[PDB]
Amino acid sequence: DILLTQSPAILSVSPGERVSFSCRASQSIGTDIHWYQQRTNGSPRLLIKYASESISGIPSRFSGSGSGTDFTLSINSVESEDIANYYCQQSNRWPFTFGSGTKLEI
Amino acid sequence: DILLTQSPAILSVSPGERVSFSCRASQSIGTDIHWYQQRTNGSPRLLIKYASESISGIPSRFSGSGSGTDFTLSINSVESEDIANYYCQQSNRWPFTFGSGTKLEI
Amino acid sequence: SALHWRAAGAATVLLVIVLLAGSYLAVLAERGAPGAQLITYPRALWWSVETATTVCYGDLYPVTLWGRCVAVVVMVAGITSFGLVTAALATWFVGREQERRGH
Amino acid sequence: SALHWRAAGAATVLLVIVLLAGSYLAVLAERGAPGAQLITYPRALWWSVETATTVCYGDLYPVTLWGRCVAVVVMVAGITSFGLVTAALATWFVGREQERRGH
Amino acid sequence: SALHWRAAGAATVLLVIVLLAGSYLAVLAERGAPGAQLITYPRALWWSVETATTVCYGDLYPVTLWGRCVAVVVMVAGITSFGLVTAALATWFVGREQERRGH
Amino acid sequence: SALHWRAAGAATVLLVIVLLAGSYLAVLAERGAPGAQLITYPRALWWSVETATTVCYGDLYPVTLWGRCVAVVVMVAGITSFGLVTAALATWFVGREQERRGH
Ligand SMILES: CCCCCCCCCCCCCC(=O)O[C@@H](CO)COC(=O)CCCCCCCC
Ligand SMILES: CCCCCCCCCCCCCC(=O)O[C@@H](CO)COC(=O)CCCCCCCC
Ligand SMILES: CCCCCCCCCCCCCC(=O)O[C@@H](CO)COC(=O)CCCCCCCC
Ligand SMILES: CCCCCCCCCCCCCC(=O)O[C@@H](CO)COC(=O)CCCCCCCC
Ligand SMILES: CCCCCCCCCO
Ligand SMILES: CCCCCCCCCO
Ligand SMILES: CCCCCCCCCO
Ligand SMILES: CCCCCCCCCO
Ligand SMILES: [K+]
Ligand SMILES: [K+]
Ligand SMILES: [K+]
Ligand SMILES: [K+]
Description:
By secondary structure, chain A is an all-beta fold. Chain A has strands spanning 4-5, 10-12, 19-25, 33-38, 45-49, 53-54, 62-67, 70-75, 85-90, 97-98, 102-105.
């Protein structure tokens, strides 16, 4: 079963900065990585599918990149509403698994 | 995306010596490595294609070798005009990527 | 009206149906199984095409008993449908050559 | 009574026999060999099916001389049996078309 | 003049065209895609040959929707062209045997 | 005397020759090349068999231009030889069925 490592577990940035979350898979999984955002008391929300593809209604400052084992979710110019926990999820092999999450602090 | 590690970042040799630059790929890429030389204020210049194949007009003291993840650019009897930055570049997988470069000092 | 052409057309539509059903059933069969990769429908249709043509890259394949049985159905349907097309081409050529020599 | 259909049926039963014997003999041939993966009978039957159809995923294959010779027998039996089915389909189509045009 | 031979020749030239166009279009389709390996034209022509013959080593394959659709066109063109050659060989043999027995 | 059977036999002997020559020439072509695996004659004959049958496991394959051109010759010879056997089987069935119905 594929371990997804999200490190560091907390990222601290200043408003307007570009930030990058890391997700490393324990084996090669092509681009079958998906990213979710979960705010305090909220349900998870899909941000990026298949490592880099946009979702309708997600602000354009969100992007994703990587393939194989190394994946990055990036935010251009962080702002306050981006304060949340961020999870990656793989669908390359059964069962689907989740990363342990990165908290964004401003 | 394939990381190409060029270490050491600076190589110091005496004239007439044989020198070897290292390029290590983060995954196996056959012989799809190409080497470029960039002198101060100059544009990059292809030296070696597909890990070992000669380019017309390049002095014969330049050679290349390796396959898989480990690649070497060699110069027989270094001379002054060889003072430059040297980059490797992979074309095995999209996107093409560059190594970070090795400077040659005499 | 000619039998060979209608059988070719039938085999084509049957093959499309088998590719779609094989995609659905391969996902159904493989999601139980740790390590299985044949578990989302878009790539399962791709896998079913490569299985039906025998153009098999090795990027995907079933690991369960029932996924492999689905695979066998797709293989035989593909090989049989293309063999049927070959046989119809031969029947057409044989008829046209009987005409060209006036028989 | 028609030769092509009886030969097709014979080839089918012969192919089933070859798949079973090839599974048994591939395991027999490969267990001597360090690194060999074609060494338990359920997956060896799966391997024999993919070899007989030429739908070859790359998940299993023989590494010994005798396992590869077994493989060659399974390949030729598979290709020949499916080619025979094609040939019988063509004979059926050719006969039916001779009838449809009244010859 | 014989239909089967002219169709075989046509299929050969069409297949060459499909291999070249498939090489070009596979590169065009795959360079958008992180991890894709089917992205330079010399090896893409090699890939198109292995796809057209179903002799598919697993060294290269498309990962995008449009590269896979290109792949399907190359598969069907290859299988159809070789099946057409088979059908023409059968028509030639059938005619020669009708002659050898004086019909 | 029948053309189809003699052509089948010819194709068989030609295929054996092509497998042996392809083994020799594939080794000759690939030993120049760093990373190449198709470089000793016993496994090169195995590779040539899998290429000729299109039963292609992915354990070996050429990486050079000339090894790939050798590969293409082996592919076409294999596919053509087996297609020729199919065509001869069809000619035999067609003749026997013409007899069984008294024509
Ligand atoms: C009832 C169960 C469903 C059974 C059939 C499912 C069909 C799935 C739709 C296929 C298109 C997916 C849309 C998409 O953007 O797919 C891309 C994902 O981003 C990649 O597509 C793919 O990579 C695979 C598509 C290969 C198609 C082969 C052509 C067959 C003649
Ligand atoms: C005399 C030597 C024996 C030769 C034949 C051996 C036959 C073995 C029985 C096959 C079923 C195994 C039962 C089982 O639960 O298998 C699963 C194991 O948990 C996985 O099955 C498998 O993964 C492989 C089965 C693939 C079958 C292909 C269909 C062929 C038309
Ligand atoms: C319009 C888009 C172009 C579409 C077709 C492109 C054709 C590319 C030229 C092919 C030769 C490359 C020259 C060279 O030195 O190639 C070597 C690279 O060093 C390795 O060759 C190769 O490894 C692949 C060649 C395989 C050829 C298969 C034979 C097909 C009947
Ligand atoms: C002129 C150049 C030579 C061209 C042909 C070379 C033929 C080589 C002899 C093959 C037997 C090797 C003896 C041996 O013990 O091989 C084993 C090595 O320990 C493994 O065998 C092997 O693994 C490969 C043999 C596969 C044979 C496929 C059958 C083809 C109908
Ligand atoms: C024709 C093959 C039947 C498909 C079986 C579905 C898989 C059930 C797994 O429990
Ligand atoms: C027809 C192939 C014969 C099978 C040989 C069995 C393997 C014996 C290995 O010592
Ligand atoms: C016949 C297949 C059409 C090829 C499509 C080219 C790829 C476009 C990707 O945006
Ligand atoms: C028919 C293919 C010719 C084989 C060429 C031999 C390889 C020479 C490599 O320099
Ligand atoms: K095949
Ligand atoms: K294959
Ligand atoms: K493989
Ligand atoms: K075939």
